[PDB]
Point group: C2
């Protein structure tokens, strides 16, 4: 490990430091010193909170760099100096004002965790699918109008986060993400899910709460690996009959929807441990039926 | 005046009515309401009211009725026959639809439909030509109806928290509109017919998704305060210099890179917010130089 380098941390006794600095309130750090290539084995480099407005060209020749964090830095444009790191495991460019994601972001292709969250960009490039080794992509609280057609080309994506985005629709190609485990579309504006949502064979946790969902598609029940489903504070009026096909589902949260009845197939949910149905329009007669259908379940109205 | 009545306040020509607290359930109203005949205000805020009898409708001399925070799942048709109701506050009651017969009232002045889960407003909402203040805050409105411009007397309109993707092209026929609050909405842009809002003094469009401002916004010569902060605005129209009476412009948190040179024509602009915007130091100097009398914040 290493720490913040003042006078390059006592000449960096031998130039083999593996970690790097951070930025606090009283550390300005407008520019980076260009003696960055010397370290030769840096695996982590953190520049959190620093007032960095540009990056030098030497950042790109450090091909031994594995994690780079440029968070909370007032860089108004994405630095293409770092896109030449063909083997970077993590890139965290969050908290930086970005109107556009650079088109050559697919040149990296060795990313594992990509954090584009808290950035004011409208669109993602078609080359976002070139990052076929990425596991976690974060797009939280960004100005995304829609996910691209090529988002299903990730082929190794395990976590996709899109909270706070202006996502009106999901692309029909989203079902090609075979390795997706965590999908987060909370606080979005999805009116409905595409029928191609059933291709997400490996999804365990699906997060759709506090969104403008009116209905659930007939093909959501093809997700036999889904365990937790959060759909609360949405505008859902009914559930499809095939919702009982969720074999492994153990948590369903349906607070604040406009539900008036539930299908009789919900009693086929043998593993459903918890069912939340409060703040929904259920007549007292049907509430007895919901309790009657699932008796092993802890159910809250 | 009056208060909450136990034993119906000692047999009571009594002028006001009750309230709802923690330990007052008050499931239903008794049908002995027609007797009072001198009610001007009637408050039922917070009562766990699930139904109304039809005897409520027989009081044609009642002018204000408040049904706030009552779990009535459907709008009571019993009250729509009160043709001379000055104020209606149906807020806090879970309502999926506003009835099409709300235009039978037509004597409303202030209508508070806010905090209700209704998807659409009926086309008879324009029949209420005497309405002054309509409150639609935090409702599930995808769009205002085409007839919203038929109100003719709407002086204050609030739609905060609504899912308004667009504003109707007929919104410019509201000649008497003074207060427009479209904060926390989802308007990508304003229609060019917004220049018909001749009487608007205060326009609230903050915390929305506005990408642009139309060219006809400068036709609002009576507009004094414009709140557009925390939007997605990338540039301002050249016609922004035509807002002669504008004295407060709030533009925090947008994506602005430059301002039109016509902003110096605003002699009455006293206060300007431009913080959290993409302004280079060269352009900040020009903006301070342009409007000299204005207190400016970057």
């Amino acid at each position: 490990g290493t720490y913040k380098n003042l006078e390059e941390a006592l000449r960096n006794p031998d130039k083999v430091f593996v970690l790097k600095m951070k930025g606090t309130e009283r550390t300005k750090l407008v520019t980076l010193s260009r003696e960055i290539v010397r370290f030769q084995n840096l695996k982590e480099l953190d520049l959190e909170g620093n007032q960095l407005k540009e990056f030098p060209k030497e950042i790109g020749n450090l091909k031994n760099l594995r994690k780079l964090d440029l968070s909370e830095n007032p860089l108004m444009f994405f630095p293409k100096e770092i896109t030449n790191l063909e083997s970077l495991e993590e890139l965290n460019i969050s908290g930086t004002e970005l109107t556009i994601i650079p088109k050559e972001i697919g040149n990296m292709n060795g990313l594992l965790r990509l954090y584009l969250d808290e950035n004011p960009f409208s669109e993602l490039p078609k080359e976002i699918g070139n990052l076929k080794n990425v596991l976690r992509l974060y797009l939280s609280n960004t100005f995304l109008k829609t996910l691209p057609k090529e988002i299903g080309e990730m082929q190794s994506l395990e976590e996709l986060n899109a909270t706070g985005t202006s996502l009106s629709k999901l692309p029909k190609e989203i079902g090609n993400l075979k390795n997706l485990s965590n999908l987060n579309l909370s606080r979005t504006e999805l009116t409905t899910l595409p029928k191609e949502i059933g291709g997400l064979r490996n999804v365990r946790l699906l997060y759709l709460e506090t969104s403008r969902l009116e209905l659930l598609p007939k093909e959501i029940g093809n997700l036999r690996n889904l365990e937790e489903l959060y759909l609360y504070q949405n505008r859902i009026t009914e559930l499809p009959k095939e919702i009982g096909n969720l074999q492994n589902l153990k948590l369903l949260h349906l607070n604040g929807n406009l539900l008036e009845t539930l299908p009789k197939e919900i009693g086929n949910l043998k593993n459903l441990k918890l069912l939340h149905l409060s703040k929904n329009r259920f007549s007292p007669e049907e509430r007895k039926r919901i309790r009657q259908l699932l008796p092993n379940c802890e159910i809250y109205f």
